Ligand binder design. Structure first.
Ligand SMILES: [C]=C1O[C](O[C]2[C]([C][O])O[C](O[C]3[C]([C][O])O[C]([O])[C]([O])[C]3[O])[C]([O])[C]2[O])[C]([O])[C]([O])[C]1[N][C]1[C]=C([C]=O)/C(=O\[C]2O[C]([C][O])[C](O[C]3OC(=[C])[C]([N][C]4[C]=C([C]=O)C(=O)[C]([O])[C]4[O])[C]([O])[C]3[O])[C]([O])[C]2[O])[C]([O])[C]1[O]
Ligand SMILES: [Ca+2]
Ligand SMILES: [Cl-]
Length: 448
């Protein structure tokens, strides 16, 4: 069952199409969050995508034809597309867009100065004590749309409905905290059908605008997940995670979109150093294995590029699929979604979707944990400096299974490509996990 999506940050439409066919579909990823496909300002920075000029499908990722081709090819491979949608603002200042359109002084091809709120700046202190300024003033100088205007709502809804007609199945509502929930409710009444919608709202507590306000209009990003997971994996004990989720004050599991990191927080855009990213190597593998095995939220795996310390820089000058060779894992695209522990975690989540309970939790009071998903699967993580050799109880059928974090079951189910894990006749497993390593097994990767 599809259970996880992925953010192919800055990947062009041709690369996404090929990836859907060659990897995402076969591996079981449910969908792909793509970078903003509408017309945006020129420039090489990754953030130019967040300054719209119009809603024409001409962007850094490609043209309208290439975008449509991607949606079709991905759909045929069984993978949905989620579009990052700018519902709060238009570009700052003046200039030119990727489709040749000019703009300036709050004047665009589709909006006039009268379609925006009067200019004011959102100050950092506004987040804590002024709801009005957070929602009516400008986020880093971006022209703030009058989202209460019938014309503005019709214009945004027309873009969304047009995308659905092409085949797009979901949408990320960027900067939702900056738009009144009531305005998003009015907008949704104009949107056809019931596409998947998730709203970006950063709420760690104490804000004038809370994430709970957006639960009726769609899923909401649970940022506490990313920060608490990073803080626990770096500075705490994994044993504390036995009740991760609602128990820690997070929103309902069925309303949350979760992640280890996202495109903003992995580069300091609102995210501290406690956030775990690809730069952390094995620590990132382990954080992802926990997230994907744990039954809370709808997770999205991150897929980045090595930015060489430049937090404003755009992606590599070479495509992912380059004349027969994959530009992954090195100093260009990182392709975390292809990392064996991460892809293995996705396979585990997909095959344990029939049991959402955490069963038989075990820990050493510190950094060694193990738990199962009933008889569907079992996992263990060792973050101590000595080998984990404890015997743990599982609800799984006795036999031999492939540790899916390190290999996979062959077509004839007579061998694995990685190490084999044995479930004894009494359901126990005698662990043998080295320092900073893990294992995951499920009922559909059992040897015959
Ligand atoms: C990013 C984000 O943001 C926000 O968030 C927020 C934050 C911030 O930082 O804060 C806070 O958080 C946190 C907390 C939590 O709790 O904690 C604490 O501790 C800390 O400290 C903090 O940090 C809050 O809460 C929050 O909320 C918002 O909200 C969000 O939404 C966001 N995200 C999103 C959105 C967006 C937009 O679309 C994006 O962004 C990007 O892009 C942009 C655009 O491009 C950029 O920017 C750029 O551009 C601009 C224009 C500029 N500005 C300039 C100019 C001017 C005139 O023209 C002036 O005015 C100004 O000032 C200047 O500066 C800039 O510079 C540039 O850069 C950005 O950057 C980026 O990021 C994103 O991505 C999304 O995702
Ligand atoms: Ca606003
Ligand atoms: Cl996000």
């Amino acid at each position: 069952t599809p259970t996880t999506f992925v953010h192919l940050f800055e990947w062009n439409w041709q690369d996404v199409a090929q990836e859907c066919e060659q990897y995402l579909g076969p591996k079981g990823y449910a969908a792909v969050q793509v970078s903003p496909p509408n017309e945006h300002i020129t420039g090489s920075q990754w953030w130019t995508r967040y300054q719209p000029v119009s809603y024409e499908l001409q962007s850094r990722g490609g043209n309208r034809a290439q975008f449509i081709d991607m949606v079709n090819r991905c759909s045929a491979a069984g993978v949905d597309i989620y579009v990052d949608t700018l519902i709060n603002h238009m570009a700052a200042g003046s200039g030119t867009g990727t489709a040749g359109n000019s703009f300036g002084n709050k004047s665009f091809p589709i909006y006039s100065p009268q379609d925006f709120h009067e200019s004011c700046t959102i100050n950092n202190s506004d987040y804590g004590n002024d709801r009005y300024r957070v929602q009516n003033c400008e986020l880093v100088g971006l022209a703030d749309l009058d989202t209460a205007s019938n014309y503005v709502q019709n214009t945004i809804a027309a873009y969304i409905n047009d995308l659905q007609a092409i085949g797009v199945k979901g949408f990320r509502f960027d900067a939702s905290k900056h738009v009144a929930a009531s305005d998003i409710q009015s907008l949704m009444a104009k949107v056809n059908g019931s596409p998947v919608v998730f709203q970006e709202v950063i709420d760690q507590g104490g804000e004038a605008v809370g994430a709970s306000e957006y639960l009726s209009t769609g899923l909401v990003t649970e940022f506490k997940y990313s920060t608490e997971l990073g803080n626990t994996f770096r500075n705490g004990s994994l044993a504390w995670l036995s009740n991760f989720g609602e128990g820690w004050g997070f929103m309902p599991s069925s309303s949350a979109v979760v992640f280890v990191d996202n495109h903003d927080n992995q580069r300091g855009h609102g995210g501290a150093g406690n956030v775990i990213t690809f730069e952390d190597g094995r620590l990132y593998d382990l954080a992802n294995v926990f997230m994907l095995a744990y039954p809370y939220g709808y997770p999205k795996v991150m897929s980045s590029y090595d930015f060489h310390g430049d937090t404003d820089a755009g992606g590599p000058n070479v495509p992912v699929h380059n004349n027969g060779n994959l530009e992954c894992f090195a100093s260009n695209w990182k392709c975390e979604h292809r990392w064996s522990y991460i892809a293995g975690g996705v396979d585990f989540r997909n095959n344990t979707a029939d049991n959402w309970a955490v069963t038989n939790w075990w820990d050493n009071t510190n950094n060694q944990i193990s738990f199962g998903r009933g008889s569907s699967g079992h996992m263990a993580i060792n973050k101590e400096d000595s080998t984990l050799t404890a015997t743990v109880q599982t609800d799984m059928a006795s036999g031999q299974y492939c540790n899916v974090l390190k290999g996979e079951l062959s077509a004839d189910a007579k061998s694995c490509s990685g190490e084999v894990i044995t479930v004894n006749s009494d359901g126990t497993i005698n662990l043998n996990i080295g320092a900073w390593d893990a294992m995951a097994i499920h009922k559909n990767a059992k040897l015959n």
